[PDB]
Design a protein around this ligand. Structure first.
Ligand SMILES: OC[C@H]1O[C@@H](O[C@H]2[C@H](O)[C@@H](O)[C@H](O[C@H]3[C@H](O)[C@@H](O)[C@H](O)O[C@@H]3CO)O[C@@H]2CO)[C@H](O)[C@@H](O)[C@@H]1O
Length: 357
C-alpha cells in the first residue's frame, strides 16, 4: 500500500462508473436469501457481473468503479452479525474484476435497512456498523490503495418530510456518529486498513446546504474523502414528475453551477478531498442534450479536481429511472456521445470504444 494522501491519489482518477442495481439490489422479501445468498445480484434485472463489463469501460478510460453493495439480508444476528460467506465471496469476486485490472474500486454499505439516521435505532446501528466493517476490512486487509471503503451511502430519515431536503438535527447527529464509528473501525483493523482511503457522506449524501453545514469532517486524517451524490440539475437529470425537462437549458446550467459552487465552497476550498460518487441524467431520448450536459458537468468538477462516477442502473426504457450507459449484455456503450463527453471534459483524448451501431 502506498502511503499517499487522498488528495494526491485522487489525481490518478479519470472518471468512474457505478455497478448500480446489482450488489445493491435489495429483494429480501421477494427472494429467499437463506436458499441462495447471491441471487440478489441479478434480482433487479441486471446480468450476473463479468470482468468483460469492466474491461469495456476501462477501454473507454473509466478507471474508478463503485460497487454499491447492500449487505442487509446477507448477515446473521446479534451479536456477531456474521456476513454470509457465499455473499462475501461473490462481493470479493466482483471487486476483483476492476481491482485486478489496475483500477480504483469503491465498496460501500448501500440500501441498508438498519442504518437510518434516527436516534431510536442509532446504538444498534453503531453496533452493526462496527461488526460489518470489521468483517469487510478483514476480508480485504491486504488490498492496496486502489480499494476504497465508503462507509454509508445516503443515510437519512427515510420516509419523513426531511428525508431528502437535507435533514434535521436528529438526522445530522446520527450520520456524524455513524461516520465516526466507520472510520474508527477500519483505522484499527489489520493489514493495509490503517492506511486505506475512506469515504463518508453527509446526510443523504446530499448536495445540500442543510447537509453540508452540519457535516462533521475529521481533523488530521489525510486519507478520508467526502462522498457526495449530485444528480443536478434535478429537473433534467432525475425528475420524473411534474417539472421535468429534456433540454439542458440556461436554468439547468445555472442550477448545476450553483451546486458545483456549493461543493467547491464546502470541500475543495476547505482543503477536503471529495468524490461525486453518483450523478447521471436519465435517458429522455435526448442524447444530444445529455452530451452537452455531461461535458459541462465534467469540465467544471475537473476544473476543481473532483472526480465523478456515473450512476448506471442498467435501465434504458420504461417509466422508471433510465440511467443505463453500458449495455452489459452485448457489451456496448449505448450513448457514445456521452462517453465522448466524459472523456473530453476530463481533458482526455476522445476515443469511444465498443460503440453501439
Ligand atoms: O427496476 C429495478 C428496481 O429499481 C429500483 O429502483 C432503483 C433505481 O432504479 C435506481 O436508479 C436508484 O438509484 C439510487 C441509488 O441507489 C441511491 O444511492 C441514490 O440515493 O439515488 C439513486 C437514484 O435514485 O435506486 C432505486 C432503489 O432505491 C426500484 O426501487 C425497484 O422497485 C425496481 O425493482
Amino acid at each position: 500500500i502506498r502511503d499517499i494522501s487522498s488528495k494526491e491519489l485522487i489525481k490518478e482518477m479519470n472518471f468512474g462508473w457505478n455497478l448500480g442495481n446489482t450488489m445493491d439490489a435489495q429483494c429480501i422479501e421477494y427472494l429467499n436469501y437463506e436458499k441462495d445468498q447471491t441471487a440478489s445480484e441479478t434480482c433487479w434485472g441486471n446480468p450476473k457481473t463479468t470482468e468483460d463489463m469492466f474491461k469495456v469501460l476501462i477501454d473507454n478510460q473509466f478507471n474508478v468503479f463503485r460497487i454499491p453493495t447492500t449487505w442487509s439480508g446477507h448477515f446473521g444476528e446479534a451479536p456477531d452479525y456474521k456476513i454470509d460467506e457465499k455473499w462475501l465471496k461473490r462481493v470479493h469476486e466482483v471487486v476483483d474484476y476492476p481491482y485486478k485490472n489496475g483500477a480504483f474500486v469503491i465498496l460501500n454499505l448501500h440500501h441498508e435497512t438498519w442504518n437510518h439516521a434516527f436516534s431510536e435505532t442509532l446504538d444498534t446501528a453503531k453496533e452493526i456498523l462496527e461488526k460489518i466493517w470489521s468483517q469487510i476490512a478483514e476480508e480485504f486487509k491486504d488490498y492496496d490503495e486502489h480499494l476504497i471503503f465508503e462507509g454509508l451511502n445516503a443515510p437519512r430519515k427515510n420516509d419523513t418530510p426531511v428525508e431528502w431536503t437535507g435533514g434535521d438535527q436528529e438526522g445530522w447527529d446520527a450520520v456524524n456518529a455513524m461516520n465516526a464509528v466507520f472510520l474508527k473501525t477500519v483505522r484499527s483493523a489489520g493489514g493495509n486498513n490503517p492506511k486505506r482511503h475512506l469515504m463518508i457522506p453527509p446526510y443523504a449524501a446530499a448536495c445540500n446546504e442543510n447537509s453540508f453545514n452540519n457535516f462533521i469532517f475529521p481533523e488530521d486524517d489525510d486519507k478520508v474523502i467526502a462522498s457526495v451524490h449530485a444528480y443536478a440539475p434535478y429537473n433534467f437529470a432525475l425528475n420524473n414528475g411534474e417539472g421535468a425537462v429534456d433540454k439542458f437549458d440556461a436554468a439547468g446550467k445555472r442550477d448545476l453551477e450553483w451546486n458545483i459552487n456549493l461543493m467547491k465552497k464546502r470541500f475543495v476550498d476547505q482543503g477536503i478531498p471529495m468524490i461525486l460518487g453518483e450523478y447521471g441524467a436519465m435517458n429522455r431520448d435526448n442524447e444530444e442534450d445529455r452530451a452537452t450536459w455531461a461535458e459541462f458537468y465534467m469540465e467544471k468538477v475537473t476544473a476543481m479536481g473532483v472526480p465523478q462516477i456515473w450512476w448506471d442502473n442498467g435501465v434504458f426504457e420504461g417509466t422508471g429511472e433510465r440511467f443505463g450507459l453500458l449495455d452489459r449484455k452485448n457489451l456496448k456503450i449505448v450513448y457514445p456521445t456521452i462517453v465522448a463527453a466524459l472523456q473530453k471534459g476530463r481533458g482526455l483524448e476522445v476515443n469511444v470504444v465498443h460503440a453501439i451501431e
